[PDB]
């Protein structure tokens, strides 16, 4: 989906992120027992700005300005 990243640590608070750590140590071992890769799921966190209208806790459709080059920050190239 190309919309998930792996956070080394939380960047909002500057505090090491438990899930992510735990995910990575199993992921690294996959020779011994091969299912363990799947635990990398824990380290995958969505990063997006989602505006939420506070007055009932639902998702409003509105538009934001972002001053940027449009073309580069398109989703990665198709094949």
């Amino acid at each position: 989906g190309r919309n998930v990243t792996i956070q080394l640590e939380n960047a909002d608070t500057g505090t090491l992120d438990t899930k992510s750590v735990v995910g990575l140590v199993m992921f690294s071992q996959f020779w011994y027992w091969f299912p363990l890769a799947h635990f990398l799921s824990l380290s995958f966190t969505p990063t997006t700005v989602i505006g939420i209208r506070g007055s009932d806790q639902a998702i409003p459709k509105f538009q934001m300005n972002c001053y940027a080059k449009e073309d580069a920050f398109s989703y990665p190239r198709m094949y």
């Binding site: 989906g1 919309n3 969505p46 989602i50 939420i52 998702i59 989703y75 198709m78 094949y79």
Partner: peptide, 21 residues
């Protein structure tokens, strides 16, 4: 419960998978 639900939707709709891969 909120945030988990808001994320599911987001990724679902907005998928950019190339199926040939």
């Amino acid at each position: 419960l909120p945030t988990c639900d808001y994320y599911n939707t987001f990724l679902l709709n907005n998928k950019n998978i190339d199926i040939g891969l």
